[PDB]
């Protein structure tokens, strides 16, 4: 059980070799914002919400994908102004195309996007342009209704349906800003 | 009382009408404020309004003289015995006005400490929303009680009305079963 010691923010901890920065920051009581991360899914670092400043690293690193190395130093949005700026910018970019659907969205009140836009978001929109739009909702089965505009394209659904369950009957489809979770055609 | 033993003809009808008139026009409250709503009740008696206009200036201090009970406040657990004692110590006929959400149903204070409606301890004639109900609403509720009092049966008519009301009440489905568009 080789334990690697590192300092997150000012404080120090020791965690099993291979533990991700986001897991360590969880263990020490620090809420790094995250959407695409999932403890039970292989890390993908897609949404870039969980950026943190790491000593010796020019770019911010996705805490969800940064394996802990010995003697590392990390400063989250609680102590790194640069990491704070990175996370807040990712949050803004995450909300520009998002529908103004909270009153009608079932996830309202339990939405990680809402909560982390409160904790790690700008007070108000800067986006005066036109939002991306999809026709919604669309059923991907008898049970599940998909609202693509609200999709932050984190790929957690797809990553679950591949890794956890061997059921890749949805996937990320199209490309660019138009990327969308989808079933094949009608299957 | 003998006034109720009259034959069910015109005598009893006219006696009922006059007695209802008089009892609605002289509906003395009991000096029994409890809470916020007690302050609004005093405000209703205050000059900006005039509860005295309706023959209700005399807030009777003794329960014996009081014909009406404006609960007007929140009935804690420790107060329910006292409130019931005061009610039982009024002399009939007596009506009870559940002034405010606290008195009528417990209001916001859905808690252990509050009885959740004086209906639990005393029969309620009229329920009055508000927190507190403004004095105009109190006067409205009192006028509705006046209407209830005037149309009041006596004697054999009283028994017939009790039977009819009982039969009607046995049929109403409970509020929890009035599922409308609620899926």
């Amino acid at each position: 059980v080789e334990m690697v010691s590192l300092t997150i923010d000012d404080h120090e901890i020791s965690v099993p070799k291979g533990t991700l920065l986001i897991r360590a920051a969880e263990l020490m009581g620090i809420q790094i914002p995250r959407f695409c991360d999932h403890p039970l899914l292989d890390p993908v670092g897609a949404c870039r919400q969980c950026l943190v400043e790491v000593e010796g690293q020019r770019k911010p690193m996705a805490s969800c994908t940064t394996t802990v190395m010995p003697d590392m130093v990390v400063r989250t949005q609680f102590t790194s102004e640069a990491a704070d700026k990175a996370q807040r910018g990712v949050m803004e970019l995450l909300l520009i195309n998002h529908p103004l659907d909270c009153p009608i969205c079932d996830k309202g009140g339990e939405c990680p996007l809402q909560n982390q836009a409160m904790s790690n978001g700008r007070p108000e929109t800067r986006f005066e342009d036109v939002k991306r739009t999809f026709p919604k909702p669309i059923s991907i089965s008898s049970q599940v209704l998909l609202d693509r505009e609200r999709c932050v394209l984190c790929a957690r659904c797809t990553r679950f349906s591949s890794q956890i369950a061997g059921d890749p009957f949805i996937d990320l489809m199209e490309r660019g800003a138009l990327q969308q979770v989808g079933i094949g055609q009608d299957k | 009382g003998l006034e109720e033993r009259l034959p069910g003809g015109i005598l009893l009808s006219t006696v009922e009408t006059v007695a209802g008139y008089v009892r609605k026009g002289s509906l003395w409250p009991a000096t029994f404020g409890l809470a916020c709503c007690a302050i609004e009740m005093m405000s209703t008696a205050g000059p900006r309004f005039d509860i005295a206009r309706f023959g209700m200036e005399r807030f009777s201090a003794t329960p014996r003289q009081a014909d009406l009970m404006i609960v007007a406040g929140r009935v804690s657990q420790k107060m329910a015995p006292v409130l019931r004692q005061i009610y039982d110590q009024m002399v009939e006929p007596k009506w009870v006005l559940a002034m405010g959400v606290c008195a009528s149903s417990g209001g916001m204070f859905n808690n252990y400490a509050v009885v959740q409606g004086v209906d639990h301890v005393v029969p309620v004639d009229i329920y009055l929303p508000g927190c507190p109900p403004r004095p105009e609403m109190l006067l409205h509720a009192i006028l509705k009680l006046h209407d209830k009092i005037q149309q009041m049966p006596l004697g054999v008519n009283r028994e017939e009305a009790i039977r009819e009301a009982e039969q009607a009440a046995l049929a109403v489905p409970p509020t929890i079963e009035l599922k409308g568009l609620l899926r």
Partner: protein, 124 residues
């Protein structure tokens, strides 16, 4: 002779629930049970004034006049009043059920066997 039980509640379903917990013959070692159902305080009081009841079950949650208030009233107003059982809509209401002087109190929702056992204890 048959025992007459006055079940008081303006909720029809609570009355049906009480009548279900207590069959026509609860505890076959006991007499038959006759049910007079009342949904208004004035009628409940008048039926009590008629008398001849072995037990009265008063829904503590009765809307226009709670069964606890009716319980206290009937104990204050009928000489040789029959024992009173109360259905309480809340566990914290127990104290008021104690004040109502009802011989027993059964919390909502009506537990059939608990209510039957309480009744048998009162009618024995």
């Amino acid at each position: 002779a048959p025992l007459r039980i006055l079940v008081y509640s303006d909720n029809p379903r609570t009355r049906e629930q009480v009548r279900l917990a207590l069959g026509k013959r609860i505890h076959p070692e006991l007499p038959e049970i006759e049910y007079v159902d009342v949904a208004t305080a004035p009628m409940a009081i008048s039926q009590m004034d008629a008398g001849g009841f072995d037990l009265a079950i008063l829904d503590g949650e009765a809307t226009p006049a709670g069964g606890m208030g009716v319980a206290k009233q009937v104990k204050d107003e009928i000489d040789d009043c029959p024992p009173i059982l109360v259905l309480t809509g809340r566990a914290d209401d127990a104290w008021l059920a104690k004040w109502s002087r009802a011989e027993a109190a059964v919390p909502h929702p009506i537990d059939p066997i608990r209510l039957s056992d309480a009744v048998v204890s009162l009618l024995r």
